[PDB]
């Protein structure tokens, strides 16, 4: 159980190299970091800052990239587990183990944790009359009751995640515990703005820039694929041996990859 | 003996640390204290007292604050009955807990239960029912004529056979729900009693902006205004700061 937990190996995911956003990200540093900077300020007006947050999904749109960037910044512990890895044949094994974190969170005041994709734990409170699968429903109750039985909150921190909420997660979350039910989804411009704000680092664009039109026409997509958009130009360079960095072959990838995932386009009706 | 520790070091609660609509407390305070302390009030009529405060209230409501309140008030001993220590894979060994509990409990005094979240174990190749049967064997014996009660809570009252829940088990039941604005107002006074603010303003009109909702978001939402004040650097809070985020907590939810 402990073995997976202490993942102290932050990657080179560079917090503040990411160009996504600010307000969300102050909101966490305000949630987390600044409380670890001068928390007397919370003591000035007498504040109990929050017990972690929960982002939402919109997959391939920046679930996690900050998070290992925070781990690159974490300046504290960092934890990592999976519910599917937590669960076992026998009864209450994992539930007996789930308790054993909070003492290992009692390890530290710098005690924080990411959690991995709950979608098979605490999903929804079906009666589960159909045998067996009540174990999950028997497990979530072992947590939430453990979570707020009688706790001074001991910097018992948390940050969670999923891909879809209303599919699951009916009653587990509650305010104060998780006051910040928050978002990540497409920006509608800023994928144009700061993504290649990053990727302009390496590449040369060895003839021009062209970026004034390598741009978004309010095109519904997810900028995560931009790290393909940088790729295949180099490949198509080497589909024709361009050792340099072009702007012309770069055209195809949006014309190629963004063109696959077609939409209905039934707007010959709202004119 | 995993939960072999009666109560904590310091319960920090009061019956006035709560809005809680003022009405759900009385019978609860009546059943728990009046047979306890004034059975002459029982024999004033010559009654058949109850044994349990059956209950259901959606979580994120101060029943559990209300639950931790009787702890700090009565000063007696206390328990916590949850599937973690209760439910165990070793068939039958799970029921050592209940027996050593109750067979002890009959000995002791003012050792009334808060066995909350029995919706875990009390739900309908599974052995949970036999533990639930292990319960009711214990209760029909002592059930009347005692200082002891059986008061706990849940999240899903329609998730259990009432074969256990006959009238001699939890008779004067309990029901919770969100407050009026006035209930939402008096609760708001509580968590307002810490910080610096623009003292002397019209808080009540914000409790007009409490539709169907929990108090828990209100003790929250004030801190986000301070967080909003933190980013605003507002050393003292105002009106609009509370507004600038509470407008967002529900719309982000809606």
């Amino acid at each position: 159980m402990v073995s997976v937990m202490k993942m102290d190996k932050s990657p080179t995911e560079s917090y503040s190299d990411i160009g996504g956003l600010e307000s969300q990200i102050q909101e966490i540093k305000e949630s987390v970091e600044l409380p670890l900077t001068h928390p007397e300020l919370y003591e000035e007006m007498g504040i109990k800052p929050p017990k972690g947050v929960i982002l939402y999904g919109a997959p391939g749109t920046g679930k996690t990239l900050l998070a290992k960037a925070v781990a690159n910044q974490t300046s504290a512990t960092f934890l990592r587990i999976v519910g599917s890895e937590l669960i076992q044949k026998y009864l209450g094994d994992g539930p007996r183990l789930c308790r054993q974190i909070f003492k290992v969170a009692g390890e530290n005041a710098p005690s924080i944790v990411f959690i991995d994709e709950i979608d098979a734990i605490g999903t929804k409170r079906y009666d589960s009359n159909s045998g067996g699968e009540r174990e999950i429903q028997r497990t979530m109750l072992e947590l939430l009751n453990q979570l707020d039985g009688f706790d001074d909150r001991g910097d018992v921190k948390v940050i969670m995640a999923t891909n879809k909420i209303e599919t699951l997660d009916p009653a587990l979350i509650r305010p104060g515990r998780i006051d910040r039910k928050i978002l990540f989804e497409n920006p509608d411009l800023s994928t144009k703005k700061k993504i290649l704000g990053i990727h302009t680092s390496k590449m040369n664009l060895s003839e021009d820039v062209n970026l004034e039109t390598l741009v978004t026409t309010k095109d519904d997509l997810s900028g995560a694929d931009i790290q393909a958009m940088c790729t295949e130009a180099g490949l198509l360079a080497l589909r024709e041996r361009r050792m340099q960095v072009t702007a012309e072959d770069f055209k195809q990838a949006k014309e190629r990859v963004m063109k696959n995932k077609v939409e209905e386009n039934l707007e010959g009706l709202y004119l | 003996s995993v939960t072999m520790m009666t109560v904590e070091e310091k319960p920090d609660v009061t019956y006035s640390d709560v809005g809680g609509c003022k009405d759900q407390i009385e019978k609860l305070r009546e059943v728990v204290e009046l047979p306890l302390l004034s059975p002459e009030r029982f024999a004033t009529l010559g009654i058949d007292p109850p044994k349990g405060i059956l209950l259901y209230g959606p979580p994120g409501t101060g029943k559990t604050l209300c639950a931790r309140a009787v702890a700090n008030r009565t000063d007696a001993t206390f328990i916590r009955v949850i599937g973690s220590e209760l439910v165990q894979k070793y068939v039958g060994e799970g029921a050592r807990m209940v027996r050593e509990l109750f067979e002890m409990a009959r000995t002791k005094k003012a050792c009334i239960i808060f066995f909350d979240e029995i919706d875990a174990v009390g739900g309908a190749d599974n052995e949970v029912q036999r533990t639930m049967l292990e319960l009711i064997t214990q209760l029909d014996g002592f059930d009347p004529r005692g200082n002891i009660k059986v008061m706990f809570a849940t999240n899903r009252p329609n998730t259990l056979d009432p074969a256990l829940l006959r009238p001699g088990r939890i008779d004067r039941k309990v029901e919770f729900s969100l407050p009026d604005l006035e209930g939402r107002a008096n609760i708001f006074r509580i968590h307002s009693k810490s910080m610096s603010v623009e003292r002397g303003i019209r808080w009540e009109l914000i409790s007009r902006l409490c539709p169907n909702s929990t108090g828990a978001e209100l003790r929250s939402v004030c801190t986000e205004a301070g967080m909003f004040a933190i980013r605003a650097r507002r050393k003292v809070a105002t009106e609009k700061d509370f507004l600038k985020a509470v407008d967002k907590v529900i719309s982000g939810y809606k």
Binding site: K89, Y90, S130, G131, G132, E135 | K89, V91, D125, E127
Partner: peptide, 15 residues
């Protein structure tokens, strides 16, 4: 010395 095992199972039945 053991007989105290019990493993959950998976089913999928018509609703």
């Amino acid at each position: 010395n053991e007989n105290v095992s019990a493993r959950l199972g998976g089913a999928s039945i018509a609703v």
